Design a protein around this ligand. Structure first.
Ligand SMILES: CCCCCCCCCCCCCCCCCC(=O)OC[C@H](COP(=O)([O-])OCC[N+](C)(C)C)OC(=O)CCCCCCCCCCCCCCCCC
Ligand SMILES: CCCCCCCCCCCCCCCCCC(=O)OC[C@H](COP(=O)([O-])OCC[N+](C)(C)C)OC(=O)CCCCCCCCCCCCCCCCC
Ligand SMILES: CCCCCCCCCCCCCCCCCC(=O)OC[C@H](COP(=O)([O-])OCC[N+](C)(C)C)OC(=O)CCCCCCCCCCCCCCCCC
Ligand SMILES: CCCCCCCCCCCCCCCCCC(=O)OC[C@H](COP(=O)(O)OCCN)OC(=O)CCCCCCCCCCCCCCCCC
Ligand SMILES: CCCCCCCCCCCCCCCCCC(=O)OC[C@H](COP(=O)(O)OCCN)OC(=O)CCCCCCCCCCCCCCCCC
Ligand SMILES: NC(=O)C1=CN([C@@H]2O[C@H](COP(=O)(O)OP(=O)(O)OC[C@H]3O[C@@H](n4cnc5c(N)ncnc54)[C@H](OP(=O)(O)O)[C@@H]3O)[C@@H](O)[C@H]2O)C=CC1
Ligand code: SF4
Ligand code: SF4
Ligand code: SF4
Ligand SMILES: [Zn+2]
Lengths: 116, 339, 156, 207, 96, 176, 48
């Protein structure tokens, strides 16, 4: 009635999580190629840790429709890296190498400015 | 009161950090990274220059509209120094050449000029003053580059008692003349080395580490009147440091020993060049001067800077010396244990 | 002689050659590129000033950024700039390349090409007339004429 | 007749009304509402499941022959449960007429892809996904078309800010173009322009 | 008129000038500060007061449609002169 | 009504076929295109001698901005901010306050000439002909910061181009 | 101008100046407004 919704690809978290793992392996196997094709200065260890970091931000989702969209955006991002539609600048934007470390504790945030 | 400019913003390009810095020698190698860091947080930077205005164009994109201001100055004109520093709150000195010209010698660029800048800075009310010396500065050293370094270092400390003095080791980076120097020796076949490089120990440091230390010395109020010593986290034999460089570049490494006098005779030959000499007798002495261990001076960890290993950042410096793209690795050179 | 005299005259010669044989590399991006074409048309004929119609990055001496620089295009512009042999000058043409112009506040536009490359002449207008761009090029030639590369070397 | 008022064409208002009922009687399973505007444009409001049946009928039926997809776009109205309105504009060269077909979806419900009906809907649906995030199922190649690679968010949504979240710059330390949080030397100035006095009584809503 | 501050910087017609210790003065080193020499408050003070013989006079700045919107100025008060709100021309009534 | 651009059938008589064979083997149409480029060689070129000759303009030309004055030297601008409201690129910034004599005048008047789309809407909106676009189009600069005009820069343009600006307005104000 | 001279006015430049870019006479932007917030000046004389 009110909770009846059309699905994207997956009908329950079991099928959804299946697609997540298929995506994780695809990204895991690709990092060595990306670090070598783009001549990146990072190591393969950092590349796979960054992939893990992106998968663990969304570990709290429980809506299969939302999980499907996260995977769909993941496959598009993967296709842009395998086919080299991206460039070395785009790949290195997951690491934020030019931004200073913004403080996370109350005192430091209090000294610099008014933002919480 | 007419200072403490009250920084505003989120520490970005269009923010205001409250630093008005006059960076002498901003058009070289170390200056290229200091202006970049100062301008990355919205700092007012005054850049005196002696070169052609065309040679300062790589600095303009480093700051927001109106933040980088260029002026003419002359090393022997105290008035031109007065104009550049009278509005600033920190003066950074990076002047220095690796060879002697027909109009400036090691005495002029490492003793007189740093003394003139320091004296004028004092008389203008500049609070902070950063001066760069060498780790191996000593008045009993064969290299005349390092003898005048020690004289100037002490001469600044008297004129500006509250000045901060930094003493880095050899610095490696994209525009360096340390790793890039151990790659163009291939032009002459083998790689000469005094005592085969087994009698020399080097402790290279990363350019960005030196840059982040300078910035943090400006903000830190405890760095006034305090001397420092920046060094990387590993010591190397000159042989295995040069061996590593040729391995990363995939070039054929052919070393052969050479007596000290012979190496200085070829050094004499290259100094004849009326342009930037490829090498000099002073370059041979410093490259073969074992880096001092100064355990009584604070290092980079006292400024909150984690030293970057030379293995991590050696590839980016030496990629352009390879003769292939996508070659396909090199193992680290042995690190001399501490103590 | 004095040495300075010889250096002064050599500076004039090399400056004369460089400002008399400018070969631009037009980055025709948006509407400002149509006016750049009209500066090559018969009425103005930039070829008569020594400015060839077009060239490739390896044989070009001046880049003319004429149009809106998007975030998707900025990396491409920088790589072309880095591959120009030196001396290399940049001319920023129009409000879009100067400071963002009509699309200054858009999410997808670089606010002035000077955030990506160093600029030498800023030509205003939306678009600048083909005469304004010609005035900009002639102003760059005077800037090259004032260069003192060899004098400063002699006093090093 | 008044020189300054648009003349009213009553004949074309009558014809499009008849065809609107005609279409509503032939596809009752999907059509939810049919209206004609005062400048003679007809709108058919359908259920999102009827995208393929309705468009196929209007393209193939002898009395419709709408063989050109003029435009396919979307509109974002956050006050609705289904915030996305997918609009199809069609043209019949045979009968020299135009019709507009509208449906609705939300962030998570995928609409069916009309590439099998009109091959022109290929890129238009890539533009909708890129700028609004509406997913079209069974699309041959669905990906961003107008935004920068790696762009996060869907710019044409009403809640996406005008200047965005990141801006590009060249950094000389890393020797490449980097992205950083956006800061503006001059904040965009917002103008409150609406007059507090009602202008068009004919469109007044119930209290 | 144009006047100089103790440090030597010219004061603009709006009253703007940088303090002695302000760091923003460094933008003028090797360059100049652009100030208009024709302060408008002084020039409009040099115009004679026009004598008219009616209670209400109208001003349009001169030039007809090249001027400013036409405004009618009341002149009953005899302790001051009616002033045009757009252009600043003053008017006075003839001894009454 | 319509016409056929390319609906033709070549004649197949031996006379016409031989004509096409002569064209194929003797390059007749190619040698007829050389004549058109030979004639242009002997026509006078259309190039003007810049900067000693200038392309024609008109009184309505939209060029560099300028703040104007009344003939008495008073500023025309009365800080109404209509130009700021209609500028489609938001390139005008204005602050105001009563002047020492009590008049309504501006303290800040900035035009960011790198945002401006040189459209003219500011001189249409102005009710006192204070902001105009003069005829200057030769004001390119070597720095971005020189194209951020403030009120002092704009009044200098008006005091510098008033002889010409006043004439152009005289020749076009009856069309407005 | 010889046949039809322009209207003369007292505030018009009597000496034309050309493009001054790249010279010590170049225009340099600045804020024409005065300071908005005034801070408190502490007393010059002690208390205890
Ligand atoms: C290739 C091989 C070349 C041969 C070897 C190199 C010798 C080349 C000699 C050619 C010199 C021609 C100089 C022409 C200068 C000219 O035409 O006027 C330009 C200008 C005048 O023209 P203008 O550029 O200022 O503008 C003209 C006016 N408009 C643009 C409005 C139409 O003269 C100069 O002020 C510059 C002088 C150039 C320097 C001349 C001295 C050269 C001495 C060389 C020393 C020996 C070197 C070894
Ligand atoms: C076929 C036709 C061939 C025509 C060739 C004719 C050449 C005419 C003579 C030109 C002589 C000058 C060419 C060198 C100019 C180099 C230059 O522009 O850069 C400035 C260079 C660089 O000066 P610098 O040392 O201050 O800058 C280097 C450091 N950076 C890059 C960071 C700024 O100056 C010189 O190297 C001086 C060159 C020698 C001057 C005396 C001439 C002797 C030349 C040999 C004979
Ligand atoms: C100073 C300049 C002085 C002029 C120097 C001669 C320039 C010649 C070029 C202009 C020719 C004029 C154009 C013209 O009449 O061509 C139209 C004519 C006709 O072109 P057509 O294509 O329209 O003819 C079609 C119509 N029918 C089928 C009837 C023929 O071209 C010719 O007739 C030229 C044919 C002779 C070419 C011979 C082959 C080349 C062999 C050269 C020797 C090797
Ligand atoms: C035959 C010609 C031989 C000369 C080759 C010179 C080396 C190549 C070169 O031009 O590099 C010069 C280099 C400075 O220029 P570079 O490092 O290439 O790039 C700078 C960009 N900012 O300068 C350098 O930093 C390195 C200079 C070379 C040092 C060689 C050391 C000589 C050792 C003795 C060799 C045997 C002597 C017999
Ligand atoms: C000589 C060609 C001209 C000629 O023979 O007279 C014209 C005559 C009329 O031809 P036609 O228009 O076709 O009329 C008959 C229609 N049933 O032509 C004819 O009736 C002949 C019909 C065509 C058959 C002969 C054509 C032979 C062409 C072969 C190529 C000859 C040239 C080869 C060498 C080329 C060297 C450049
Ligand atoms: N590079 C390294 O490995 C080390 C650096 N240092 C010292 O720190 C400082 C940083 O130098 P660095 O950037 O690394 O190397 P650079 O040689 O590239 O620095 C050159 C800078 O100093 C200027 N300069 C040289 N001579 C003069 C002079 N007579 N008058 C005016 N300016 C002059 C140059 O101006 P211009 O370009 O116009 O000629 C330029 O701005 C130096 O003192 C250096 O000795 C200490 C230990 C290691
Ligand atoms: S500045 Fe004007 S003419 Fe030039 S590209 Fe931008 S909008 Fe088009
Ligand atoms: S011409 Fe148009 S864009 Fe430029 S300042 Fe005037 S209103 Fe704004
Ligand atoms: S519209 Fe005219 S009078 Fe009003 S603020 Fe703008 S320039 Fe001044
Ligand atoms: Zn008036």
């Amino acid at each position: 009635a009110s909770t009846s919704v059309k699905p994207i690809f997956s009908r329950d978290m079991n099928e959804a999580k299946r697609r997540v793992r298929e995506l994780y392996r695809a990204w895991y196997r690709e990092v060595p190629n990306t670090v070598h094709l783009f001549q990146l200065d990072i190591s393969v260890k950092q590349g796979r840790d960054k992939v893990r970091e992106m998968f663990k931000k969304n570990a709290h989702i429980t809506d299969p429709r939302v999980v499907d969209l996260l995977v769909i955006k993941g496959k598009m991002e993967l296709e842009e890296t395998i086919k080299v539609w991206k460039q070395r600048t785009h790949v290195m934007r997951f690491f934020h190498e030019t931004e200073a470390p913004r403080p996370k504790d109350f005192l430091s945030k209090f000294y610099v400015g008014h933002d919480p | 009161l007419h200072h403490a400019v009250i920084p505003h913003g989120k520490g970005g390009r269009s923010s205001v950090s409250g630093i008005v810095a006059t960076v002498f020698g901003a058009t070289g190698f170390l200056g290229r990274y200091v202006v970049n860091h100062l301008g990355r947080m919205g700092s007012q930077v005054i850049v005196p220059h002696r070169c052609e205005p065309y040679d300062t164009m790589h600095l303009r994109p480093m700051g927001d509209l109106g933040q980088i201001i260029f002026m003419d100055w002359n090393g022997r004109d105290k008035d031109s120094i007065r104009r550049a520093v009278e509005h600033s709150s920190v003066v950074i000195n990076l002047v220095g050449r690796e060879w002697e010209t027909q109009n400036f010698d090691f005495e002029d660029v490492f003793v007189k000029i740093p003394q003139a800048i320091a004296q004028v800075s004092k008389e203008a009310g500049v609070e902070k003053f950063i001066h760069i010396s060498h780790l191996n500065a000593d008045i009993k050293s064969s290299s005349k580059y390092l003898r005048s370094k020690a004289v100037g270092e002490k001469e600044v400390r008297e004129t500006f008692p509250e000045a901060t003095i930094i003493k880095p080791a050899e610095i490696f980076g994209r525009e360096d003349r340390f790793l890039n120097y151990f790659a163009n020796i291939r032009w002459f076949g083998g790689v000469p080395l005094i005592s085969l490089g087994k009698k020399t120990v080097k402790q290279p440091v990363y350019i960005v580490d030196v840059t982040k230390g300078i910035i943090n010395a400006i903000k830190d109020p405890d760095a006034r009147g305090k001397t420092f010593a920046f060094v990387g986290p590993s010591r190397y034999l000159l042989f295995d440091l040069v061996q590593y460089v040729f391995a990363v570049a995939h070039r054929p490494f052919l070393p052969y020993p050479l007596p000290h006098f012979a190496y200085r005779w070829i050094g004499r030959l290259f100094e004849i060049s009326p342009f930037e000499p490829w090498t000099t007798r002073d370059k041979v002495e410093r490259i073969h001067t074992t880096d001092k261990i100064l355990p009584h001076l604070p290092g980079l960890e006292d400024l909150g800077v984690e030293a970057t290993p030379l293995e991590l950042k050696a590839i980016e410096v030496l990629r352009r010396h390879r003769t292939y793209r996508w070659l396909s690795d090199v193992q680290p050179a042995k690190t001399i244990p501490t103590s | 002689s004095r040495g300075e005299y010889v250096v002064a005259k050599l500076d004039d010669l090399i400056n004369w050659a460089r400002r008399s044989s400018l070969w631009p590399m037009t980055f025709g991006l948006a509407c400002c590129a149509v006016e750049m074409m009209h500066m090559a048309a018969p009425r103005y004929d930039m070829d008569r000033f020594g400015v060839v119609f077009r060239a490739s990055p390896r044989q070009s001496d001046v880049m003319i950024v004429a149009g809106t620089l998007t975030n998707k295009m900025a990396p491409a512009l920088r790589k072309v700039y880095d591959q120009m042999p030196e001396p290399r000058y940049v001319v920023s043409m129009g409000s879009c390349a100067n400071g963002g112009g009509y699309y200054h506040y858009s999410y997808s536009v670089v606010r002035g090409c000077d955030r990506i490359v160093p600029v030498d002449i800023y030509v205003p207008g939306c678009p600048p007339t083909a005469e304004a761009l010609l005035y900009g090029i002639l102003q760059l030639q005077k800037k090259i004429k004032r260069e003192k590369r060899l004098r400063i070397w002699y006093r090093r | 007749t008044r020189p300054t008022v648009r003349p009213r064409n009553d004949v074309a208002h009558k014809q499009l009304s008849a065809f609107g009922e005609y279409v509503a009687e032939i596809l009752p399973k999907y059509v939810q509402q049919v209206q004609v505007s005062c400048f003679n444009e007809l709108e058919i409001c359908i259920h999102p499941d009827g995208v393929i049946p309705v468009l196929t009928f209007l393209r193939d039926h002898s009395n419709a022959q709408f063989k050109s997809l003029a435009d396919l776009t979307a509109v974002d109205i956050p006050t609705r449960q289904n915030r996305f309105e997918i609009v199809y504009n069609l043209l019949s060269l045979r009968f020299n007429s135009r019709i507009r077909v509208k449906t609705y979806t939300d962030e998570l419900t995928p609409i069916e892809s009309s590439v099998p009906v009109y091959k022109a809907a290929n890129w238009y649906e890539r533009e909708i996904w890129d700028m609004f995030g509406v997913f079209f199922a069974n699309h041959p190649d669905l990906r961003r078309i107008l935004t920068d690679y790696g762009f996060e968010g869907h710019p044409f949504r009403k809640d996406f800010p005008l200047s965005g979240y990141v801006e590009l710059r060249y950094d000389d330390e890393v020797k490449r173009v980097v992205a950083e949080p956006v800061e503006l030397a001059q904040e965009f100035r917002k103008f409150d322009l609406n007059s507090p006095w009602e202008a068009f009584p004919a469109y007044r809503q119930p209290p | 008129g144009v006047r100089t501050s103790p440090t030597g910087e010219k004061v603009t017609h709006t009253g703007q000038v940088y303090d002695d210790g302000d760091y923003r003065k460094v933008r003028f080193v090797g360059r100049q500060k652009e100030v208009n020499e024709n302060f408008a408050i002084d020039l409009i003070a040099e115009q004679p007061v026009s004598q008219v013989g009616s209670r209400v006079i109208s001003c349009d700045g001169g030039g007809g449609a090249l001027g400013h919107p036409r405004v009618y100025i009341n002149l009953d008060k005899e302790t001051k002169t009616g002033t045009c709100g757009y252009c600043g021309l003053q008017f006075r009534q003839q001894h009454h | 009504t319509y016409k056929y651009v390319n609906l033709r059938e070549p004649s197949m008589d031996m006379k016409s076929v031989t004509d096409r064979a002569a064209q194929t083997l003797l390059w007749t149409e190619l040698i007829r295109g050389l004549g058109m480029t030979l004639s242009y060689l002997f026509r006078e070129p259309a190039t003007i001698n810049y900067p000693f000759e200038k392309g024609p303009l008109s009184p309505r030309f939209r060029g560099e901005h300028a703040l104007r004055r009344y003939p008495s030297g008073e500023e025309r601008c009365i800080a109404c901010k209509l130009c700021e409201a209609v500028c489609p690129a938001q390139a005008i910034t204005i602050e105001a306050e009563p002047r020492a004599d009590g008049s309504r005048r501006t303290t800040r008047y900035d035009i960011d000439m790198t945002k401006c789309i040189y459209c003219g809407f500011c001189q249409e909106a102005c009710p006192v002909d204070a902001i105009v676009e003069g005829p200057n189009f030769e004001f390119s600069t070597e720095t971005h910061e020189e194209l951020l005009y403030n009120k002092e820069k704009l009044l200098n343009n008006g005091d510098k181009w008033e002889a010409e600006i006043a004439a152009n307005i005289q020749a076009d104000y009856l069309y407005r | 101008p010889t046949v039809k001279p322009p209207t003369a006015r007292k505030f018009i430049w009597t000496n034309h100046k050309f493009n001054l870019s790249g010279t010590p006479q170049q225009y340099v932007p600045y804020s024409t407004t005065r300071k908005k917030i005034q801070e408190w000046v502490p007393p010059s004389t002690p208390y205890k």
